[PDB]
Design a protein around this ligand. Structure first.
Ligand SMILES: [Mn+2]
Ligand SMILES: [Mn+2]
Ligand SMILES: [Mn+2]
Ligand SMILES: [Mn+2]
Ligand SMILES: [Mn+2]
Ligand SMILES: [Mn+2]
Lengths: 314, 314, 314
């Protein structure tokens, strides 16, 4: 089972700029080379080139709707292709709106996939509930079937077909949810482990339950969309929306190690690393490093250590 | 069930000054306005005016006995009043000696109340055990029935009548207890969860047990006296007595979220925030912010999010 | 049961210098004086004087083999002596290679001892598996019986006789293991709780299991070799090999408080504190302080507090 890194240097999903530098920062830290040290075969598709849609007027409150919709349609095609060839796709963010194309493309090949969303946010605001027209906080809204027709068709997203049900997604790390978003997750019966559930159960029981909930009845492909801000700012400070009281570096790697062990990881998103948002240079390094470590963990790197087979190290 | 904020800008309870600025700092951060966004009805009683008792000579080792006793008697009257009207009182500290008047006044209306004391300290030194004559460190001593007559009557506190039994108080976050205090808690059989119990059980099991212990036999009003230094200095640095190895920001909010869910919160104290004790401006902000978050959590704010009822956000 | 502090100002175990200043740094913080405040009788043996072996040519890849082997043989003699007199030995590190002499000397008196190794590393590389000829990372290799004859006899260590079986050692805090080391621990069936086990079980269940594994069948002397880097760099930054995602300050003290309570602590190592490796002065202080706190914890200091017996503090 091969791995294919796909760079999504896109930031139109939010008002700030910088997140598009995420892929470069991750590559600069040797993400690709390090992944090749794992048991997986790695191919680098490179960074996608996003054609900016000229005169991309706001759709009501939604900002850059056509540009975000275009970039995502292109990502969806790329991901769908690698998924078709039977490889595991790894999208390096810019902003989380790219999860639309990533999950959409993944679903075209594995419609029965489930989603594990690690984030401090639900990113489930609809074009009608957002306070900011930022699409970075609306990904899940365009992806959920139960939300189809709950908001006006946004220009640039007509190609999107709701691919996952509220029952196939599980959030982990929630701690900054808007009223409308909270209304949506409760009304839709979405499974989640906000920081309070993590504190109560412990990351161990949490992963145990998310797997039982998403995989108990049937084993299907796992799509992990990891927003770096799901971890506490003390670990991933270089993000647009840091929120205190986050998952620890350890819980982050625990989540990933467990996902690796299921042997069902099919798609991965490493989003929101903004190299321009560090108070100091080492804060960026610290954020980039942990994102890289999380990715490596997803593909086998265990904290207890790793060693190559058929190798009598003695 | 209405909420009434009562400011206790008092710092005579300790040698340092600055804690009296706590209420102003908390209000400055919008604590009142933010509370109004909750499901609770909020009224601001304002800050009490403390008449300094002139020529307040030390009683043996105890410092400013008359001034601390007076300020507390006044606080006890105010709190007793709001409690009588059926509102939940919220005292914003200065120093923890104000817990004497706050808990005393609370007990006049709900004598069967229990106390959950979140602190790095037991604050149970008597006028005979204290190394420093600081009344900040002696609150529980004046409040416990089992300690009545165990120390000479201190000028200014004759109005105080021990209102809670050793069996009705539970400590959480202990990690800096004097020999005499340790002797007192063990000899009195006081229930506590020091940092070592928290590490062992997890904050989840801890709240589970404190409620079983204090509420298992009978459901009664809960008085939460929260010393900000109960959380690690990395979260609430702006306090007079920081102690490493404290509760985390998350465990702090977990405690509060759980207390809210009992529906029994009757009295609250947010003490020890000293705006003048930050090594930098943002350490004060960090301390004030978390104190405000803890207060909001006590009244409904959940990390998983909140939404208003009878509101089809969609 | 008396305590005897033995300084091991040695750093030849690694390429960098500075760790030999560890003992001085710990003493400078009043470690000795503080220990005397505990219920234990304390004697300071002082710092050993290590005769540098001139012309200490590398043995294949292994650096300073004769000097490290010599220092350890001397330490082994000293520790064996204090152990014989029925005192608990406490070795203040330089580097962890000194665990060879420390554990070897300890074993001469208590051959049935078990080892609890708190470290981010297994330090079990053999002179054949090390990428660096650093003996700081090969301690356990020279100590394990199952590894006897698995590598060429290194000059300076002929005096060493494998004293512990793979079944008598338990690692805690692992998160940076070489492939060969990982191969060795898995092949040898060594018991360990890497950071992932800690995350899964909680430090409480972990100590519970390490004691059940090492003490369930028979109660025997406990030798605690504590590498300061076992705790996260945020707590012990002043070390040669910091690794993110470490044990917290609290889990560190939990481990020690539990070890104390077994009443079986026989030998202690406080290693890797390098005063010259702090990015700032307070990072050293922070590292030194925590090493000192851990040591005091091993000998009785409880976070819930301590008080002297036959002393009516009231
Ligand atoms: Mn987010
Ligand atoms: Mn997100
Ligand atoms: Mn306190
Ligand atoms: Mn207090
Ligand atoms: Mn180490
Ligand atoms: Mn070591």
């Amino acid at each position: 089972k091969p791995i294919e890194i796909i760079g999504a240097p896109f930031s139109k999903g939010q008002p700030r700029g910088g997140v598009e530098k995420g892929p470069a920062a991750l590559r600069k830290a040797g993400l690709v080379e390090k992944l090749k040290e794992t048991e997986y075969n790695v191919r680098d598709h490179g960074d996608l080139a996003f054609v900016d849609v000229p005169n991309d007027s706001p759709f009501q409150i939604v900002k850059n709707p056509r540009s975000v919709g275009k970039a995502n349609e292109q990502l969806a095609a790329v991901v769908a292709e690698t998924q078709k060839n039977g490889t595991i796709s790894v999208v390096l963010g810019g902003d989380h709106s790219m999860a639309i194309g990533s999950i959409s493309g993944h679903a075209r090949v594995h419609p029965d996939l489930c989603v594990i969303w690690v984030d401090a946010h639900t990113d489930i605001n609809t074009p009608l509930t957002t306070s900011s027209g930022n699409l970075c906080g609306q990904p899940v809204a365009f992806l959920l079937k139960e939300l189809k027709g709950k908001f006006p068709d946004v220009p640039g997203f007509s190609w999107v077909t709701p691919c996952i049900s509220a029952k196939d997604i599980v959030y982990i790390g929630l701690r900054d949810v808007d009223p409308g978003e909270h209304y949506i997750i409760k009304t839709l019966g979405i499974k989640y482990f906000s920081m309070t559930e993590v504190d109560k159960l412990g990351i161990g029981k949490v992963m145990e339950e998310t797997f039982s909930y998403l995989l108990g009845r049937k084993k299907r492909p796992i799509h992990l969309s990891f927003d770096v801000d799901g971890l506490d700012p003390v670990f991933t400070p270089a993000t647009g929306t840091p929120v205190v009281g986050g998952l620890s570096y350890r819980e982050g790697l625990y989540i990933t190690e467990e996902i690796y062990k299921t042997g069902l990881l099919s798609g991965l998103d490493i989003m929101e690393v903004n190299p321009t948002l560090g108070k100091t240079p080492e804060e960026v390094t610290r954020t980039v490093n942990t994102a890289v470590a999380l990715t490596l963990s997803c593909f086998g790197t265990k904290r207890e250590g790793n060693h190559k087979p058929e190798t009598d190290y003695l």
